[PDB]
From a paper:
NbUGT72AY1 is a promiscuous transferase that glycosylates bioactive hydroxycoumarins such as scopoletin and umbelliferone, as well as monolignols involved in lignin formation and various other small molecules. Five distinct GT protein folds have been identified that are capable of GT activity (termed GT-A to GT-E). NbUGT72AY1 adopts a GT-B fold comprised of two distinct N-terminal and C-terminal Rossmann-like domains (shown in cyan and brown in Fig. 2, respectively) of seven and six parallel β-sheets, respectively linked to α-helices, connected by a linker region and an interdomain cleft. The catalytic mechanism of inverting UGT such as NbUGT72AY1 is a direct displacement bimolecular nucleophilic substitution (SN2)-like reaction enabled by an enzymatic base catalyst.
Complex V and IV represent the SI and product-inhibited enzyme complexes, respectively, as they were obtained in the presence of an excess of substrate (scopoletin) and product (UDP), respectively. Asn372, Ser373, Glu376, Arg249, Ala351, and Trp350 frame their donor binding sites and in both structures, the indole ring of Trp350 points in the direction towards the uracil structure of UDP2FG and UDP, resulting in a π-stacking interaction. In all UDP/UDP2FG-bound structures (IV, V, VI, and VII), the indole ring system of Trp350 forms a π interaction with the uracil ring. In all structures that have scopoletin bound (III, V, VI, VIII, and IX), H2 has 2-3 turns while conformers associated with UDP (IV) and UDP2FG (VII) have 4 turns. The product inhibited protein structure IV and SI complex V show closed active sites with distinct electron densities for the residues from 310-326 in IV and V, while catalytically active VI and VII lack electron densities for this region due to the high dynamics and the loop may remain open. The non-productive complexes IV and V are compact, fully resolved, and display a closed active site. Phe53, an amino acid of helix H2, interacts via π-cation binding with Arg214 of the UDPG-binding pocket and approaches Trp350 4.1 Å in SI complex V and 4.0 Å in the product-inhibited structure IV, while the distance is larger in all other structures. Aside from the closed active site, the amino acids in the nonfunctional structures move closer together, resulting in a more compact complex and a higher number of non-covalent interactions. The lowest number of interactions (total edges) was calculated for the protein in the presence of β-carotene (II), while the highest number of bonds was obtained after addition of UDP (IV_A and IV_B), which is consistent with the assumption that the carotenoid promotes protein dynamics, while in the product-inhibited complex the mobility of the protein is hindered.
Author numbering:
A (entry chain B), B (entry chain A): 5 to 477
The structure:
């Protein structure tokens, strides 16, 4: 039985994919897993989440080892982007990770490292341990990241200022609009960190991705066979998705109990992930749009911010004492007493999304969220905010046909309550709504097939374990 | 009942479309047809093809009259392109065609002339007979040909040296790379012959094309309604395609018998049309790529040439006595004894492509070939060589999504056996392969709809017969 160590980047958005991957391997592929989870400075949430997961392993086939964050406040400023921040954190923690692996009683045979932990190459190489990246999102975004080194040299000026879509060899073309956050401003350090990340991928022995063949056959084939791309990559790709939490059934969840009282596929779940937050004006538009729709809803709400759309990613612990009602339109909660259920800070998305009464998901198009929705056969309103979400949203709406979206990107134009209402009703009242759901259910099934024995993703994991064992010479 | 005469240009590429058109009109539109087929000096292929078609007409509603080629060796030289050659041939045969039509017991009411026979205007006009061109290819190429008169005056220097794509009003933009052969070298006489051809179209009473509305709705609309284009065209367009041979089921075809022994959609058919030939180096790369793919194949091979990619166009009868094995890598045939079947010179392409075991087509993107594939629901590897094929290949790969292709044009960069293998496996092993096939089958159905009663193409033929009868005042 192999020992594999998986390094998790800071934040729940990265920690969860890693935990899920480790669980997947331990359960379905009979592997010992050690998750090296890079912690954030301010979340007893993340830490106690880890304590609850360590408590559940009687079988110790999975073990969790936290990596304490190094203080980088002296390295950053008010304009430093989360991309850059995570990269820096990882880099500054590399010595600690070295000492950890060195101090391990029994070494890992392999090391799989989250998207931001690509800077840990030297440690794996030094110890002579098989090294892979986990890209817990789309192959499209991976292809963009890799080929970005080429774009950097072939394109002058900002990508956002281009007239023609970016053509990644063998992939679907990307409009300036839908680019990932690093490519928005090339003058920003996160951009160069990103081009660098794109290159760093290729230095690993392989790349796991949380997608599958059915979902992205063309992009995956491009990574494997497109000659321009392969000139850059030259290492195996492992579509192993869609990996997500299996639903833990809680009898004491009042949200679930409200949902039990609802009709099948009658509820819209509304959430922008752990990181997402809306502006005051947009959150107001949203409150009223939901009201106007007269559809039933469950809405995870956070205090609004008119700054960065992911500014709640590291700052969810910042104790804003204000009640929900204070940053909602007055009496909204009084008027939607029957119609909806407003949830503070976080909820068990998965358990919610698996509930029969849920029939719609207004999402930021975070890949974890997306996967969770699709695997439960839920159609979506695409509301991209940060990271790669615009790109995923383009994929979801245009190509896959499992989501609808505003005429202009939410991050570009205010989505008014009239449009919000209209979208919500399309999803929840109309036949367009039905057919979106059917497609999402088809994707649900294709995903179930990929993960089930002999599926592309099951097999891709077997190929991975092969790759690892062939390297243990 | 109308009498229509259809003039065919030299070579199988042109003769077949004309035969098919005549058959289509005679059968489905109850018309008397007389096909005036301009012959090549050396093809028992062309002649026996004619014998097979003459044998089928007990009803003589279609009759075939050969036009013997005139000797033009004194008019050409070693640098004279096939474009120019065909134009000259036609021109020099014009008197003979005149005497033929003049000597006809009962005149044709109309005259439809192949792409290269646009120089027969004077004969039709003189006799006062309705005159049309048949453009047995894409509307995109037609639009380019017509608008080329404008490009000539608006662009200085070579098209191949332009930075921006050529924009034909109302159509998809064309990269320098994908231009038709005449536009490659403007200093060449074939270029001016081509600009001239583009203009000549517009002097006819109408233009038939072997495409349909579903396939090229926007280009067709542009021809009809774009003001810039209409300033040049001002005559009706008739999308009547996709017209091709109906499959004649042949007793002692050994290729068909090999195919019978194969699995469904397990065979790659490989062919570069009547004209196409590969360089020695490329044909070697190809042999090995097919070998490496470990996919089953049927491959129509011709002796290689490092010169003109269509240099087998007028030499298709010339029995080069060299065995296949002499211009293939040694023992290739010995090693692929089980895996493939290498065919010399010609093959019932239509009957092969309709065979259940055929699941892939590596093609030069000749429009007849393309149509044959699409109408049988076969996905393609786009390998453009000559004429307009690059442009068709762009259309097939980028827009339609029914073909895959090399990173760089085959005629630009050597396609190595690694890439060949990869492409072949994408098509024949992967899910990308599956979905390309489904799209090709959707096109198959849309085509079936166009041709069936009341379809755009059926109707376009009815519109044509209307046009002819309104001109018989
Ligand atoms: O109320 C919430 C908000 C978020 N999440 C989870 O937290 C992550 C969202 O974080 P992020 O904004 O990075 O989006 P992602 O790309 O992870 O979906 C996903 O795993 C969601 O399942 C959740 O379970 N409940
Ligand atoms: O081995 C071969 C090669 C070509 N063809 C036929 O010859 C015609 C030539 O059309 P193509 O698309 O190849 O155009 P070209 O490039 O020859 O002008 C088509 O009907 C093909 O089916 C055939 O029957 N067998």
């Amino acid at each position: 039985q192999l020992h594999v160590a998986i390094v998790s980047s800071p934040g729940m958005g990265h920690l969860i994919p890693v935990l899920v991957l480790g669980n997947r391997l331990a359960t379905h592929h009979n592997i010992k897993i050690t998750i090296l989870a890079i912690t954030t400075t301010s979340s007893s949430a993340e830490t106690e989440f880890l304590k609850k997961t360590t408590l559940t392993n009687e079988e110790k086939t999975i073990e969790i080892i936290p990596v304490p964050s190094v203080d980088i406040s002296h390295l950053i400023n008010s304009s430093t982007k989360i991309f850059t921040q995570l990269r820096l954190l990882v880099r500054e923690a590399l010595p600690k990770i070295h000492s950890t692996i060195a101090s391990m009683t029994h070494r890992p045979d392999a090391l799989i490292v989250d998207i931001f932990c690509t800077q840990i190459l030297p440690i794996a190489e030094e110890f002579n341990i098989s090294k892979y990246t986990y890209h817990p999102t789309t192959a499209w975004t991976l292809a963009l990241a890799i080929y970005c080194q080429v774009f950097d040299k072939e394109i002058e000026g900002e990508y956002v200022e281009l007239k023609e879509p970016l053509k990644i060899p063998g992939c679907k073309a990307l409009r300036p609009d839908d680019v990932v956050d690093p490519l928005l401003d090339r003058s920003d350090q996160q951009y160069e960190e990103y081009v660098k990340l794109g290159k760093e991928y290729t230095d690993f022995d392989g790349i796991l991705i949380n997608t599958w063949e059915d979902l992205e056959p063309e992009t995956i084939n491009a990574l494997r066979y497109n000659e321009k791309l392969r000139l850059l990559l030259k290492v195996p790709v492992f579509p192993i998705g869609p990996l997500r939490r299996k639903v833990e059934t809680t009898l004491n969840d009042e949200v679930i109990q409200w949902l039990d009282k609802q009709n099948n596929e009658s509820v819209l779940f509304v959430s922008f992930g752990s990181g997402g937050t809306l502006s005051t004006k947009q959150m107001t538009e949203l409150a009223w749009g939901l009201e106007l729709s007269q559809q039933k809803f469950v809405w995870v709400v956070r205090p609004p911010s008119d700054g960065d759309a992911d500014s709640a990613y590291l700052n969810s612990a910042g104790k804003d004492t204000r009640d929900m009602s204070e940053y909602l339109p007055e009496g909204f909660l009084t008027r939607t007493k029957d119609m909806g259920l407003v949830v503070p800070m976080w909820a068990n998305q998965v358990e919610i999304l698996s509930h029969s009464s849920v029939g719609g998901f207004l999402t930021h198009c975070g890949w974890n969220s997306t996967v969770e929705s699709l695997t439960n056969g839920v159609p979506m309103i695409a509301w991209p905010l940060h990271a790669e979400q615009k790109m995923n949203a383009a994929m979801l709406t245009e190509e896959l046909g499992v989501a609808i979206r505003p005429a202009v990107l939410p991050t570009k134009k205010l989505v008014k309550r009239e449009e919000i209402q209209g979208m919500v009703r399309i999803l929840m009242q109309t036949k367009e709504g039905k057919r979106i759901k059917e497609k999402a259910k088809k994707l649900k099934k294709s995903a179930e097939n990929a993960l089930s024995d002999g599926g592309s993703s099951y097999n891709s994991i077997c190929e991975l374990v092969k790759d690892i064992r062939s390297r243990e010479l």
